[PDB]
RNA sequence: AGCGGCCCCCGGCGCGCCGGGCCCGGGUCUUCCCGGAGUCGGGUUGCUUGGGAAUGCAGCCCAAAGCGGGUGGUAAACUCC
RNA sequence: CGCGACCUCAGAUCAGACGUGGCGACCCGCUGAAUUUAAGCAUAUUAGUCAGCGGAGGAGAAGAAACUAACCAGGAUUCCCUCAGUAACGGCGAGUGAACAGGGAAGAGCCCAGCGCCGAAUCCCCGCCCCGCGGCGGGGCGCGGGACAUGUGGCGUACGGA
């Protein structure tokens, strides 16, 4: 039974909502369990970074997040090859791989390539056993710095550009932005039907010629 | 090799050859019992393709099962209730005959655990399937690293729970714009978190 | 002049340069190798043809094309599969005429 | 019938075998040995 | 009415050829078990 | 998705060094203002704006907004 | 209360000593596979779904192909992606 | 007219293993309502819910695309926030009702068959010697039995590759 000028509402309580309620009373213990697990893992993997392997750069899909950049899941097998790395040992260095990916550009590829090459510069690989065969670092650096990193590795951050001031020429003052947009929508809308009436016009031009 | 030539053959289930054979075997099996053991397969390639290796510890049974739908089991019709639910005849059970057959064999043979199955015959009122079974405690299977996954206490009675190829179909599992239930793992679990209210502390 | 990068029309999009390489020829599935072809045409002479496609080859000798397609479409399903099939069965009759009339 | 269940359950009578299983789990189902002599 | 592709497994040989055929192939039989052990013994013994 | 903005609330995307160092040194400075950086796509002509020859970059424009800018002695630029 | 003490057992983490296994990598040419059937798929029916000229599931009928097959949220044909 | 075989098929207090029943808060699969709301009621809602029958573990299930998308593109599954009381369904009436993208917890990928090469290069049981024996294993010698060519093991599975 309604009354003077309120809202109309539709609440979703006509079921038995009451056997199935959920309390967030275990919120802190859930936090506490994780730390002791998150610490202990990093103690298990002693010098290795706690966050995990390295992850790549990846742009976000849609028109809304068209512009931003984030961290992905795996380097592709194309871009590894360019670095000269095998898809089997990389998992052991700390490198991530997903082979479901593609590449439909070149400027994406060169960036993640240049990321990998800095990585192996800043890497440190211990020898298995005291002998020092190929790709085994010197004891000097191997003792000084052998410690974990805190947080992610080579973090992703969105850079911007700075187009400096410049003088406005006349080629720009005499540009008609709005009208060009309106023309553009139109041509994309009538691109097909024009040709079809034109083709039919030309397919009767033969009748005019015959 | 040869298992290919055989394969394209069985894809032609209407030539004079296969019409002959199947008509002949259904005669035969129809005379035997409802459940009996077979010594060896009738579709060897298919069985190899599901995971039948030819060693001792693997088994083949054959099964008969009657066709049709499901009559609502009650007295003389007369379901006591709404007009929507006066339905007794044009009703269609929610699992396939193939998975039904696996179930009988699992219940009759309790130690033996069930791998998968396939089709070999058809008739007006019967339909015949073969079923592939395993003995877990035979040492040939215990000592082989690549098939002792099933000697764990967890892969009991797969047929009773929907975990073969023929059981996984009826549940409805997939990834796309077509399923959207079973996002959790199953229909119940989706129903829960959607019809479950979450009351935080602070709000 | 002074064309800018529009965001709409026939030619839109933040412009880039493409890379070109081998494709994932996982996309090369369902293609016809010679050894596999030797199989299917061998089994064809051994087992033979089915009754509906047999019924159809009558209509095609008498050049009743339209009815052939509709029969097959009822008896199979989709328009496409029918169109492909009708052309196969015609080629079958071609070798027949080619082989016999000499 | 909740009541009808709870009058005959696993926890109602003697449990003359489970009572020790609980005591044996607490050490690891050891067997075949003794403590140190004296 | 038995079709031919099955029927051709009833047009078979007679006595006089099958004996010649079996009598021949009895010379080209595979390696018997423990005829194989002897073979290996003698074979890897040839390293001296 | 098309977040909108007017002209009055445009010089606030940039700091105060910019707007003051313009109208100064008399080179034809005419700074550059990206809206897609600060989370906006289309430009709208609600208000007015003070006399400096600014440049703007945005995906879309409106008719009156394009006018006011050229009226003050600036320009408009499109991007993808 | 205490980076307090004494005793007993069970842990695991690593260095020694024989046994047996394994002789097991990566850059330029010719062949291979194009791969899993009463199954996809299509009709008609019944239950279900937000899924609407049929989301999903099952019965009965018909029943495939191999530069093919599926998807591309309005039925159908013709074509490009 | 005795032996080899399987179409095959029964028997034994034969030697050696196994399954059944119980609890059932959390989990998986089937089956499955009426009160009630609509100020009446028959579709709808209550509800894929109570009751009912099965089957388990310390978690279970799902799971490494016959995907999402239309972007300068992402990239197994699972839980949280949000998208959202929205798009859509509906005696278009009472009423119902999701997904993607974005940010986080955690993060790990891999085997077969079929094509194809390798003197079946492979497995089980009894016998004897030696270590080890209370989660019955290892090493060696038996012209000792058996399964297997109606296909056992090594190389190798679309990450496109081999
Ligand atoms: Mg009020
Ligand atoms: Mg179907
Ligand atoms: Mg409903
Ligand atoms: Mg039980
Ligand atoms: Mg009422
Ligand atoms: Mg009332
Ligand atoms: Mg009433
Ligand atoms: Mg009703
Ligand atoms: Mg309902
Ligand atoms: Mg219940
Ligand atoms: Mg599991
Ligand atoms: Mg809102
Ligand atoms: Mg509902
Ligand atoms: Mg998401
Ligand atoms: Mg994290």
From Swiss-Prot, chain A:
Location in the cell: Cytoplasm
Pfam families in alphabetical order: Ribosomal_L13e
Keyword Manganese: no
InterPro entries recorded: Ribosomal_eL13
Cross-link (Glycyl lysine isopeptide (Lys-Gly) (interchain with G-Cter in SUMO2)): 122, 144, 173, 176
One Gene Ontology CC term in the entry: cytosolic large ribosomal subunit
Residues the record lists as N6-acetyllysine modifications: 15, 176
GO MF term (any one): structural constituent of ribosome
Modified residues (Phosphoserine): 76, 105
Cross-link (Glycyl lysine isopeptide (Lys-Gly) (interchain with G-Cter in SUMO1)): 173
Keyword terms, alphabetized: Acetylation, Cytoplasm, Isopeptide bond, Phosphoprotein, Ribonucleoprotein, Ribosomal protein, Ubl conjugation
GO biological process annotation, one example: translation
Keyword Secreted among UniProt keywords: no
Role of this protein: Component of the ribosome, a large ribonucleoprotein complex responsible for the synthesis of proteins in the cell. The small ribosomal subunit (SSU) binds messenger RNAs (mRNAs) and translates the encoded message by selecting cognate aminoacyl-transfer RNA (tRNA) molecules. The large subunit (LSU) contains the ribosomal catalytic site termed the peptidyl transferase center (PTC), which catalyzes the formation of peptide bonds, thereby polymerizing the amino acids delivered by tRNAs into a polypeptide chain.
Family indicated by similarity: Belongs to the eukaryotic ribosomal protein eL13 family.
Assembly mode: Component of the 60S large ribosomal subunit (LSU).
Protein name: Large ribosomal subunit protein eL13
Organism of this sequence: Oryctolagus cuniculus (Rabbit)
Encoding gene (name): RPL13
From Swiss-Prot, chain B:
Subcellular location: Cytoplasm
Alphabetized UniProt keyword annotations: Cytoplasm, Isopeptide bond, Lipoprotein, Myristate, Phosphoprotein, Ribonucleoprotein, Ribosomal protein, Ubl conjugation
The keyword Cytoplasm belongs to this UniProt entry's keyword annotation: yes
Alphabetical GO biological process terms: cytoplasmic translation
InterPro entries, per database record: Rbsml_eL15_core_dom_sf, Ribosomal_eL15, Ribosomal_eL15_CS, Ribosomal_uL23/eL15/eS24_sf
Location of Phosphoserine modifications: 33, 96, 99
Main location: cytoplasm
Superkingdom of origin: Eukaryota
Basic residues composition bias: residue spans: 168-181
SMART domains: Ribosomal_L15e
Region of interest (Disordered), residue spans: 164-185
Covalent lipid sites (N-myristoyl glycine): 1
GO MF annotations, alphabetized: RNA binding; structural constituent of ribosome
Keyword Plastid: no
Pfam families assigned: Ribosomal_L15e
Record's GO cellular component terms: cytosolic large ribosomal subunit
Job description of the protein: Component of the large ribosomal subunit. The ribosome is a large ribonucleoprotein complex responsible for the synthesis of proteins in the cell.
NCBIfam families, A to Z: PRK04243.1
Quaternary data: Component of the large ribosomal subunit. Interacts with IFIT1 (via TPR repeats 1-4).
Similarity comment: Belongs to the eukaryotic ribosomal protein eL15 family.
Designated name of the protein: Large ribosomal subunit protein eL15
Protein source organism: Oryctolagus cuniculus (Rabbit)
Taxonomic lineage from the root: Eukaryota, Metazoa, Chordata, Craniata, Vertebrata
From Swiss-Prot, chain D:
Species whose genome carries this gene: Oryctolagus cuniculus (Rabbit)
Subcellular location: Cytoplasm
Family label: Belongs to the eukaryotic ribosomal protein eL37 family.
Function: Component of the large ribosomal subunit. The ribosome is a large ribonucleoprotein complex responsible for the synthesis of proteins in the cell.
Record note on quaternary structure: Component of the large ribosomal subunit.
Full protein segment contained here: 50 to 87 of 97
Organism phylogeny: Eukaryota, Metazoa, Chordata, Craniata, Vertebrata
Coiled-coil boundaries: none
Stated name of the protein: Large ribosomal subunit protein eL37
From Swiss-Prot, chain E:
Domain of life: Eukaryota
Location of cross-link Glycyl lysine isopeptide (Lys-Gly) (interchain with G-Cter in SUMO2): 23
Regions annotated as coiled coil: none
Modified-residue entries (N6-acetyllysine), positions: 23
Localization per record: Cytoplasm
Family recorded in the similarity comment: Belongs to the eukaryotic ribosomal protein eL8 family.
UniProt subunit comment: Component of the large ribosomal subunit. Interacts with CRY1. Interacts with DICER1, AGO2, TARBP2, MOV10 and EIF6; they form a large RNA-induced silencing complex (RISC).
Function description: Component of the large ribosomal subunit. The ribosome is a large ribonucleoprotein complex responsible for the synthesis of proteins in the cell.
Protein's UniProt name: Large ribosomal subunit protein eL8
Organism: Oryctolagus cuniculus (Rabbit)
Gene name of this polypeptide: RPL7A
